[PDB]
Design a protein around this ligand. Structure first.
Ligand SMILES: OC[C@H]1O[C@@H](O[C@H]2[C@H](O)[C@@H](O)[C@H](O[C@H]3[C@H](O)[C@@H](O)[C@H](O[C@H]4[C@H](O)[C@@H](O)[C@H](O[C@H]5[C@H](O)[C@@H](O)[C@H](O)O[C@@H]5CO)O[C@@H]4CO)O[C@@H]3CO)O[C@@H]2CO)[C@H](O)[C@@H](O)[C@@H]1O
Ligand SMILES: OC[C@H]1O[C@@H](O[C@H]2[C@H](O)[C@@H](O)[C@H](O[C@H]3[C@H](O)[C@@H](O)[C@H](O[C@H]4[C@H](O)[C@@H](O)[C@H](O)O[C@@H]4CO)O[C@@H]3CO)O[C@@H]2CO)[C@H](O)[C@@H](O)[C@@H]1O
Ligand SMILES: [Ca+2]
Length: 629
């Protein structure tokens, strides 16, 4: 039987769970897929509210697992896995084994450079540049009996709003799509949405392919998908708890544990340099594991031909601390129930766990906040690392990994999402490395939480950085990074971030006994419950400072290139964001948004983001379990 839980917070979790699953609230599509947000006029990472993300699915798993903990019913958790596999993990039809089985482990992909401005794309493929060897593919095909990959594609157009349909039929739903393709300066406002399955039916003469990559001959019809590593790791994290909670009640989620273990096996592709170049010696092709940084990178992607048989896979050279998950690594490398079937799965994850904790410590600022990350591909072209730049195993420090518009590490959210995983690990194992990181990080954040007399509160929203960490010497360890500083630019009341923060502090307090952390966590949860509840969960009014880009952001299109979006929108040089998404004008909030822009005001919205609502729910459950009295 499961231990007793605090009745007050369990009830709050149960209430949120009901609001999230309530058909009248509209968090899910008719197929049972959760939307990024109830509201459709939404641009921030995805560019439409009713697309879904692997991030949303992993939060859906966490929510249902927690529900299973309190109700004893785990059919919902098993259902979240069923929906994931059916809709976000490309099936046999979406990534034909005929093409995947032609993959060549000695030549994973063809090199192409990355540019710091979208106008430099398409990027030219260069077969003469070296590419290392893929050491894990043989392990995976042997263990699973297929060349297809088992990982979640990161974004899905749930109701076929864009019109690409399924495998180019233009009418089926959901629809696999992708957006980001052109480097660090290509914000969510500067992309050209494209289908994952490109048969040249939409877009230009060769679909959307030659907008991004330039080859010698005619572009072939092809498919391609991109994984968001932190989402798949969260899925493993959530499944571990579901397993633990199910067993305390004599229940079983065996089938789901198997899916999560397999996903974690394939997730190892994020451990590798984009083109398998040796870590620390980017000019040389790797000979296998010497190309593994063992961190959860920004992504791993794969694709192949549709009418001809060939395929490729790439890792990523860019690493952000916000994506790490020491807990998932601990699970996959130590729990017998989650041991991957591949020969080196568990051991590789053991190496990743140690490497990840070194990464966090190397990046810990003088104050306590965690700095950006590192890359094995300076400027995305394996250029020489500037002299004076600090390094981590030969990789150069980057303040804002992968994206600069806006900086990927200027949002406070990354801090709590990532440190929450460190807190779970510390809670379960009492690991000294984790304790050291949290003692300093928790003292920093506890001094930045502001409670107002009227019950509202504020926490860091936007942050900035100065300096860099000292070069990492594994035998020396943390130097204190006296020249690395974080600065809080402004504060806000992001309910998702505040919930994740409460979660982190609760796990930490439960293990360390730190009263300050426990009372701040409870005050946060109470303040949100008492002052921000509405009929759909919780919400607050927030400013959408970037919405002016709906109308004034020009989207780059190569000279002479012309094409059409499924709905007829013309794609050509000169178009603005709204020009290739004209359906947005039929959105209920459109007129309101435009009226505000015309009056020179900043638009505001009251948003219900799926991950935020779940984050709040889960945080209540976690508190209920760790502080039953
Ligand atoms: O086709 C002929 C030829 O292909 C060769 O293979 C090429 C392939 O053609 C290219 O399309 C492919 O290009 C990849 C880029 O190198 C890479 O930079 C880009 O990365 C994007 C990713 O597409 C996108 O999904 C991802 O989005 C993330 C968001 O940024 C995050 O905010 C969110 O949280 O998570 C999502 C998901 O991670 O962003 C990244 C980074 O910008 O992906 C391109 C593919 O989509 O390169 C291949 C190799 O060069 C092949 O080798 C030849 O054999 C073949 O003939
Ligand atoms: O979605 C897949 C992808 O998601 C990544 O995580 C995203 C979240 O999905 C997204 O909701 C989140 O959006 C933030 C946004 O970045 C902030 O800028 C914004 O905060 C604003 C606020 O809106 C303003 O009112 C205020 O004035 O300024 C602040 C600061 O600009 O808050 C929203 C909601 O939290 O962004 C996340 C980071 O990109 C994952 O990282 C990735 O792994 C997933 O694949
Ligand atoms: Ca830009």
């Amino acid at each position: 039987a499961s231990s007793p839980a605090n009745k007050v917070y369990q009830d709050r979790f149960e209430s949120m769970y009901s609001k999230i699953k309530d058909p009248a609230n509209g968090y899910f599509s008719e197929q049972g897929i959760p939307y990024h947000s109830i509201e459709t006029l939404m641009v921030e990472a995805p560019d439409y509210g009713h697309v879904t993300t692997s991030q949303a699915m992993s939060y859906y798993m966490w929510l249902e697992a927690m529900h299973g903990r309190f109700s004893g019913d785990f059919t919902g958790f098993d259902k979240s896995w069923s929906v994931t596999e059916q809709y976000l993990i490309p099936t046999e039809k979406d990534q034909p084994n005929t093409s995947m089985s032609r993959y060549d482990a000695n030549k994973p992909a063809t090199y192409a450079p990355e540019f710091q401005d979208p106008s430099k794309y398409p990027s030219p493929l260069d077969t003469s540049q070296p590419v290392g060897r893929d050491p894990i593919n043989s392990q995976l095909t042997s263990a699973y009996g297929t060349s297809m990959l088992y990982g979640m594609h990161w974004i899905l157009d749930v109701d076929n709003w864009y019109g690409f349909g399924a495998r180019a039929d233009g009418t089926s739903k959901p629809s696999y799509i992708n957006t980001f393709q052109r480097g660090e300066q290509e914000s969510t406002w500067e992309t050209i949405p494209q289908p994952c399955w490109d048969e040249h039916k939409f877009g230009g003469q060769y679909g959307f392919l030659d907008l991004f990559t330039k080859d010698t001959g005619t572009p072939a019809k092809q498919f391609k998908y991109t994984n968001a590593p932190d989402a798949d790791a969260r899925a493993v994290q959530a499944t571990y708890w579901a397993d633990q909670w199910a067993k305390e009640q004599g229940k079983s989620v065996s089938t789901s544990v198997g899916k999560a273990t397999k996903m974690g096996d394939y997730l190892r592709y994020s451990f590798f340099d984009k083109y398998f170049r040796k870590i620390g010696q980017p000019s040389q092709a790797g000979t296998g594991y010497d190309a593994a940084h063992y961190l959860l990178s920004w992504y791993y992607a794969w694709g192949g031909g549709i009418d001809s048989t060939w395929s490729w896979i790439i890792g990523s050279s860019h690493n952000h601390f916000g994506y790490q998950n020491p807990f998932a690594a601990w699970v996959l490398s130590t729990d017998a129930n989650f041991k991957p079937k591949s020969s080196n799965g568990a051991s590789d994850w053991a190496k990743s766990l140690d490497r990840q904790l070194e990464f966090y410590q190397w990046l810990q600022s003088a104050e306590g906040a965690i700095a950006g990350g590192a890359t094995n591909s300076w400027n995305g072209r394996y250029e020489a690392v500037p002299s004076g730049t600090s390094t981590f195993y030969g990789m150069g420090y980057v303040e804002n990994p992968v994206y600069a518009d806006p900086g990927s590490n200027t949002w406070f959210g990354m801090q709590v999402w990532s440190m929450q995983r460190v807190a779970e690990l510390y809670y379960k194992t009492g690991d000294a490395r984790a304790k050291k990181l949290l003692d300093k990080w928790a003292k920093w954040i506890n001094g930045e939480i502001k409670f107002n007399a009227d019950g509202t509160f504020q926490i860091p929203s936007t942050i900035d950085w100065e300096g860099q960490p000292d070069t990492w010497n594994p035998t020396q360890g943390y130097t204190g990074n006296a020249n690395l500083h974080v600065k809080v630019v402004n504060y806000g009341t992001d309910l998702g971030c505040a919930s994740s923060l409460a979660n982190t502090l609760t796990y930490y307090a439960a293990k360390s006994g730190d009263e300050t952390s426990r009372q701040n966590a409870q005050k946060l949860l109470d303040a949100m419950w008492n002052n921000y509840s509405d009929s759909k969960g919780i919400s607050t009014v927030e400013q959408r400072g970037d919405y002016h880009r709906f109308l004034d952001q020009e989207v780059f299109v190569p000279a002479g290139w012309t094409g059409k979006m499924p709905n007829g929108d013309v794609i050509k040089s000169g178009v603005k964001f709204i020009d290739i998404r004209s359906k947005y004008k039929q959105d209920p909030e459109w007129q309101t948004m435009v009226a505000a822009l015309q009056a020179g005001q900043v638009p505001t919205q009251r948003l219900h983001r799926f991950w935020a609502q779940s984050e709040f729910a889960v945080a209540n459950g976690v508190y209920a379990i760790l502080f039953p009295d």
